[PDB]
């Protein structure tokens, strides 16, 4: 590979030079003859697989703290090496855990919020043994991160994978999400994205209120055991009713959303160690709710209803009634969060901050991997600066990864 | 291997085999994706390329290994041997041109690919000739508002010193002027080209929407200036169906998007001059041309007139203004009976096209970064459509601006 790759911004003419891509560790899925950049997704580590992965990470940590080649560095290498030899795995120090979590975020190509990467509260839950204990750790996380509306980015990290039959898993895709219910007539109540998970919860014993915005229970698996249900205390679940600054009728739509986006189904990989339960949270970009959650056809799908209340001509697509309604909905989401003082960022601010982050990263780190397809917001793409910015995408480690759904793999006891 | 693409909204899963055919590089590697980067002969090289193309042409007309097929390969071989090149048949030319369009991974309008009027201009020898061919193209394609896709193909490259080139980036574009106070009048995208026209003798009206002259290079000679006859230039005054004040902005655009700086490659042959044209998707003008910061940049002016609060970005004043502008553009073109497609309609057609191509051809190369419209992305079906990008030939390629290579 070429040592220097250039990216250009076609709006500002600014040219950046990437050297960091040489540290790329895994495959993107693309080849020389085909690009898979719009594909959504294109038994444990053996001792010999584990050695060089650990060393790579340890070197990286010690390089970051300006102690590369030091006695403490060489000693840590030796201690790790001996641990893998005698136990087939190793345990990270707290400092290394914190560094690795922050870097998984820093390395997340698809995240437009990474300017904040170094400000991440890390909770070490590696001493947790039961699903009840996971619940306790999770409640504390939610309360800390919510902070009465002044959100704080955080991650809680449960014990790493051992033999793969003792995995810790949060079965929820996010800590807070709304139930979806399929009706006998084929219609869907609540959030259609969550129907499958909802059915599992009901089967596991959950009594469903069967409403439109029912906060799902936690379904928590510890040490490879069967998962257990827990209700999050409602006072810990911060929600915002959606209203519009001009349209008095908007509140009559009865919409609301939760303040804390807290993804709980990813896998954190550090130094070849695998943390299958590592729920993390930041705060929302408005479009996540206003465009995707509300206006996707396979989600809440509210465009028609809003357009009708806006008295728009909905007969021809060329009237842009959809686009017109889309903007008002996103105005409403941002207005409601700001009014209740719950942290949220609009897509203009977020993308402008990302450009500055990207430029800084190129300066100090020699690059910043970015997935344009994900970075560009789902509305008004070209009026944000990221649209015009060439990006290079590649995978650095530590990283957040997708993993299979736990109900697909779990061995029921 | 067979590759699958999934639509995440419909859950439809298509299977791509067509990608196995590509031999050209994309720029990405196993470790680095360049999907958002805008830009990632000899007898010996020439014959296999010719052979590949003849083969797929005769394969496409259901006569692979026919008597005609064998003879053509032999004929082409002799011609490359004895002349260092070869000439396409008319049929091959037309097939080649339609397929370059079909294979254009960045084009959302490809449902139309087989409907393309091909104007053969390979007998052209002078800039005056080029002008004549171009006028006929514009007149035919414009068709009084009922636009018709067309391509005019000028003689292929020989030694590189005698290229035919249309120096304009589009046949019809507006001039851009650098003002004493450092601002720009008209279209900033064309400031450089405009300056070259001025220096070559063009007397500029110095307005906001001055139709540029044609600057035409034939056979490697110095380019020459021509004024397109105004009656051939269809333009649309932009008004809004609800905001009576919108027409007071004095905005307009031309009806015919006619890209003129690309290179058409067929069977190893290079057509450095091949202006082609279709019709507009509204966002091209309403989002990019009008609202890009580096273009006409009208958002602030429009938002003023809408009396929006422009203090905080979270008011989404830009997004509001953007929608209204695009409403105006569509309404204006439609009211004037000038062909235009909205991004909802176009992306919808593109999905149907993809379905067609997977069914009959085994896939469809597509560049999601370009296919998804620059506004309202995820409320169009292409946002939710996984796409595989790969390079098939015949193709349209970029080439350098002629003023960076030409000696006078
Ligand atoms: C602090 C404010 C943050 C903002 C505004 C933000 C913004 C975003 C947005 C808008 C996306 C696209 C999500 C989607 O469309 O589904 C995203 C993706 C992502 N974010 Fe961030 N984020 C923040 C914090 C975090 C944190 C704290 C982490 C981890 C420590 C993180 C890691 C990721 C990852 C791994 C993805 C890719 C998600 C996927 O592939 O499904 N982000 N972020
Ligand atoms: C008939 C109606 C057509 C529509 C609605 C349409 C639509 C579009 C749009 C919106 C783009 C993106 C352009 C940009 O953002 O700059 C594009 C790209 C492209 N189109 Fe089409 N198009 C049409 C006809 C054609 C024709 C007739 C040809 C050639 C024979 C063609 C070949 C291409 C190529 C090569 C690109 C890529 C341009 C580049 O790489 O800069 N299209 N099309
Ligand atoms: C349909 C689908 C969607 C997704 C995106 C989920 N990722 C959301 C996410 C992740 C991290 C975030 C961090 C901050 C924030 N505001 N939003 C964040 C949102 C993944 C997989 C599939 C599948 N299959
Ligand atoms: C600034 C820049 C822009 C571009 C995109 C031009 N693509 C226009 C185009 C091409 C073909 C079209 C076909 C139909 C249509 N409606 N519009 C069509 C518009 C490429 C290179 C550079 C550079 N440097
Ligand atoms: C098909 C396409 O890859 C898919 O719809 C992607 C596009 N870009 C995205 N970008 C973000 N931020 N989030 C998404 O879910 C998606 N979906
Ligand atoms: C940097 C990025 O590749 C560039 O801005 C692209 C993005 N997608 C695009 N898509 C279309 N249709 N037209 C464009 O000019 C661009 N520009
Ligand atoms: Zn790629």
Q: What is the CATH number of the domain that holds B138?
A: 3.90.440.10
**Substitution target from A8, A28, A37, A358 for chain B, most B beta carbons within 10 A:** A37
**Which of A294, A390, A109, A382 shows the shortest CA–CA distance to B377?**
A382
* CB contact at 8 A, A232 and A145: no
Segments of A166-227 assigned E as strands: 169-170, 180-182, 188-190, 218-221
* Interchain CB contact of A7 with B (< 8 Å): yes
Residue B252 in 3-state DSSP? strand
Residue B208 in 3-state DSSP? coil
Residue B33 in 3-state DSSP? strand
Q: Please tell me whether residues B112 and B174 are part of one structural domain.
A: no
The burial class, CB within 10 Å (0-12 / 13-18 / 19+), for B126 is: middle
Alpha carbon of B388 to ligand 7 centroid (Å):
9
Longest dimension (CA), chain B: 73
Contacts with B195 (C-beta within 8 Å, 6 or more apart), sequence order = none
Q: Please tell me whether residues A35 and A106 are part of one structural domain.
A: yes
Contact at CB, B38 and A10, closer than 8 angstroms: yes
Residue B358 sits in which domain range?
A: 16-122+149-159+263-277+347-371
Closest residue, chain B, to A372 (C-alpha):
B36
Q: Please tell me whether residues A116 and A210 are part of one structural domain.
A: no
* Element spanning A46, H or E: none
Structure tokens that stand for B21 in this block = 């055919």
**A163 CB neighbour count, 10 Å cutoff:** 11
Distance CA(A299)–CA(A180), nearest Å, equals 10
Q: Please tell me whether residues A133 and A179 are part of one structural domain.
A: yes
- Cα-to-chain-centroid distance, residue B263: 11
CATH no. for residue B48? 3.90.340.10
* Interchain CB contact of B373 with A (< 8 Å): yes
Contact at CB, A37 and B369, closer than 8 angstroms: yes
| DSSP bridge partners of B281 | B341
Residue A111 a catalytic site member: yes
A388 CB within 6 A, ligand 6: yes
Distance CA(B118)–CA(B90), nearest Å, equals 10
Which residues of chain A have a CB within 8 Å of the CB of B291? 382-383
Contact at CB, B314 and A334, closer than 8 angstroms: yes
Q: Is B101 annotated as a binding residue?
A: no
| Backbone phi, psi, residue B216, to 5° | -120, 125
* Interchain CB contact of A246 with B (< 8 Å): no
B4 within domain boundaries: no
Number of H-type helices and E-type strands within chain A? 12, 18
* Interchain CB contact of B300 with A (< 8 Å): no
| Backbone phi, psi, residue B188, to 5° | -65, -25
**Which of B286, B274, B278 shows the shortest CA–CA distance to B256?**
B278
Residues written for chain B: 408
The answer, yes or no, to whether the previous bond of A51 is cis (omega within 30 of 0) is: no
* CB contact at 8 A, B217 and B164: yes
B320 within domain boundaries: yes
Q: What method was applied to determine this entry? A: X-ray
Q: Are strands A344-345 and A284-285 parallel, antiparallel or unpaired?
A: parallel
CATH no. for residue A257? 3.90.1230.10
Distance CA(B275)–CA(A341), nearest Å, equals 55
Distance CA(A35)–CA(B84), nearest Å, equals 35
| Backbone phi, psi, residue A332, to 5° | -60, -50
B379 within domain boundaries: no
Angle at A232 between CA A280 and CA A226, to 5 degrees: 80
Distance CA(B144)–CA(A368), nearest Å, equals 50
* CB contact at 8 A, A326 and B316: no
- For tokens 């250039």, the residue is A6
Nearest residue by C-alpha to atom 15 in ligand 6: B370
Number of domains in chain B: 3
B6 within domain boundaries: no
Nearest residue by C-alpha to atom 23 in ligand 3: A40
Measured from CB, residues less than 6 Å from any atom of ligand 2 are B 101, 104, 106-109, 112, 116, 149, 151, 276, 278-279, 281, 284, 341, 346, 370, 396
Q: Please tell me whether residues A322 and A356 are part of one structural domain.
A: no
**Which of A126, A130, A122 shows the shortest CA–CA distance to A156?**
A122
* Element spanning B13, H or E: strand B13-16
- For tokens 């959809």, the residue is A322
A82 within domain boundaries: yes
Query: Which stretches of A195-320 are DSSP H helices?
Result: 195-203, 286-287, 294-295, 303-309
B207 within domain boundaries: yes
Contacts with B67 (C-beta within 8 Å, 6 or more apart), sequence order = none
* CB contact at 8 A, A54 and A87: no
Distance CA(B362)–CA(B219), nearest Å, equals 40
**Torsion over CA of A223, A224, A229 and A235, rounded to 10 degrees?**
40
* CB contact at 8 A, A308 and A368: no
Mutate to test the pocket of ligand 6, among A351, A387, A391 (most ligand atoms within 8 A of CB): A387
**Which of A393, A36, A40 shows the shortest CA–CA distance to B389?**
A36
- Cα-to-chain-centroid distance, residue B238: 23
Residue A114 a catalytic site member: yes
B384 within domain boundaries: no
Structure tokens that stand for B395 in this block = 């193709």
Distance CA(B307)–CA(B275), nearest Å, equals 42
The answer, yes or no, to whether the previous bond of B72 is cis (omega within 30 of 0) is: no
Q: Please tell me whether residues A33 and A97 are part of one structural domain.
A: yes
Q: Are strands B269-271 and B117-120 parallel, antiparallel or unpaired?
A: unpaired
Q: Please tell me whether residues B271 and B285 are part of one structural domain.
A: no
Structure tokens that stand for A68 in this block = 């590369």
Closest residue, chain B, to A296 (C-alpha):
B379
The answer to whether the Cα torsion of A324, A325, A326, A331 is positive or negative is positive
Q: Which ligand places an atom closest to the C-alpha of A287?
A: 1
Q: Is B357 annotated as a binding residue?
A: no
Structure tokens that stand for B13 in this block = 């899963």
DSSP designation for A233? P
**Which of B107, B118, B128, B115 shows the shortest CA–CA distance to B153?**
B118
3-state helix, strand, coil in chain B (%, to 5): 40, 15, 45
First and final C-alpha spacing in chain A? 49
The answer, yes or no, to whether the previous bond of A202 is cis (omega within 30 of 0) is: no
B302 within domain boundaries: yes
Q: Please tell me whether residues B89 and B134 are part of one structural domain.
A: no
* Element spanning A348, H or E: helix A347-365
Distance CA(B36)–CA(A18), nearest Å, equals 15
| DSSP bridge partners of B277 | B150, B258
Contacts with B297 (C-beta within 8 Å, 6 or more apart), sequence order = B291
Q: Please tell me whether residues A24 and A108 are part of one structural domain.
A: yes
**Which of B221, B272, B223 shows the shortest CA–CA distance to B213?**
B223
**Which of A346, A290, A390, A308 shows the shortest CA–CA distance to B318?**
A346
- For tokens 């940049």, the residue is B297
**Substitution target from B33, B285, B384 for chain A, most A beta carbons within 10 A:** B33
Q: Please tell me whether residues A22 and A158 are part of one structural domain.
A: yes
Closest residue, chain B, to A318 (C-alpha):
B342
Distance CA(B214)–CA(B193), nearest Å, equals 11
* CB contact at 8 A, A300 and A293: yes
Q: Please tell me whether residues B175 and B224 are part of one structural domain.
A: yes
Alpha carbon of A123 to ligand 7 centroid (Å):
36
Which residues of chain A have a CB within 8 Å of the CB of B287? 382-383
First and final C-alpha spacing in chain B? 51
Measured from CB, residues less than 6 Å from any atom of ligand 4 are B 109, 257, 259, 278, 280-281, 284
**Which of B188, B168, B169, B165 shows the shortest CA–CA distance to B178?**
B188
Q: Please tell me whether residues A255 and A178 are part of one structural domain.
A: no
User: B301 vs A222, B304, B308, B351, CA distance in Å?
Assistant: 59, 5, 11, 36
Distance CA(B336)–CA(B349), nearest Å, equals 23
- Cα-to-chain-centroid distance, residue B403: 20
Which residues of chain A have a CB within 8 Å of the CB of B342? 317-318, 320
């Amino acid at each position: 590979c070429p040592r220097f790759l250039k990216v250009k911004n076609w709006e500002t003419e600014v040219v950046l030079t990437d050297t960091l891509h040489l540290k790329s560790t895994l495959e993107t899925g693309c080849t020389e003859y085909i690009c898979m950049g719009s594909i959504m997704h294109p038994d444990v580590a053996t001792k010999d697989q584990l050695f060089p992965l650990a060393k790579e990470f340890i070197d990286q940590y010690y390089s970051s703290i300006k102690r590369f080649g030091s006695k403490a560095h060489m000693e840590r290498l030796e201690e790790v090496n001996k641990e893998i030899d005698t136990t087939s795995t190793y345990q990270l120090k707290d400092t290394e855990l914190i560094y690795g979590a922050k870097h998984a975020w820093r390395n997340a190509s698809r995240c437009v919020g990474r300017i904040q990467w170094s400000k991440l509260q890390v909770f070490d839950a590696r001493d947790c043994t039961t699903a009840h204990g996971m619940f306790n750790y999770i409640c504390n996380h939610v309360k800390y991160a919510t902070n009465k509306g002044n959100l704080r980015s955080a991650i809680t990290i449960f014990p790493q994978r051992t033999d793969g039959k003792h995995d810790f898993r949060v079965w929820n895709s996010q800590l807070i999400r709304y139930a979806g219910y399929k009706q006998p007539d084929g219609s869907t109540l609540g959030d259609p994205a969550n129907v499958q998970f909802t059915e599992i919860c009901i089967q596991q014993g959950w009594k469903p209120p069967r409403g439109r915005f029912d906060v799902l229970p936690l379904l928590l698996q510890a040490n490879g055991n069967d998962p257990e249900l827990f209700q999050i205390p409602p006072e810990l679940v911060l929600e915002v009713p959606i209203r519009h600054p001009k349209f008095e009728w908007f509140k009559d739509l009865g919409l609301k959303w939760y303040g804390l986006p807290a993804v709980s189904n990813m896998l954190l990989e550090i130094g070849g160690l695998e943390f299958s339960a590592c729920p993390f949270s930041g705060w929302y970009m408005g479009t996540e709710i206003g465009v995707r959650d509300y206006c996707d056809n396979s989600r809440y799908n509210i465009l028609e209803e809003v357009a009708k209340k806006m008295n728009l001509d909905m007969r021809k697509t060329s009237s842009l009634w959809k686009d017109q309604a889309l903007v008002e909905i996103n105005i409403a989401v941002l207005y409601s969060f700001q009014s209740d003082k719950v942290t949220i960022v609009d897509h203009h601010s977020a993308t402008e901050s990302f450009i500055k982050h990207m430029e800084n990263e190129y300066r100090c780190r020699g690059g910043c991997p970015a997935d344009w397809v994900w970075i560009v917001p789902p509305m008004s793409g070209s009026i944000t600066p990221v649209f015009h910015q060439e990006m290079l995408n590649y995978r650095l480690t530590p990283s957040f990864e997708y993993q299979p759904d736990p109900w697909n793999t779990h061995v029921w006891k």
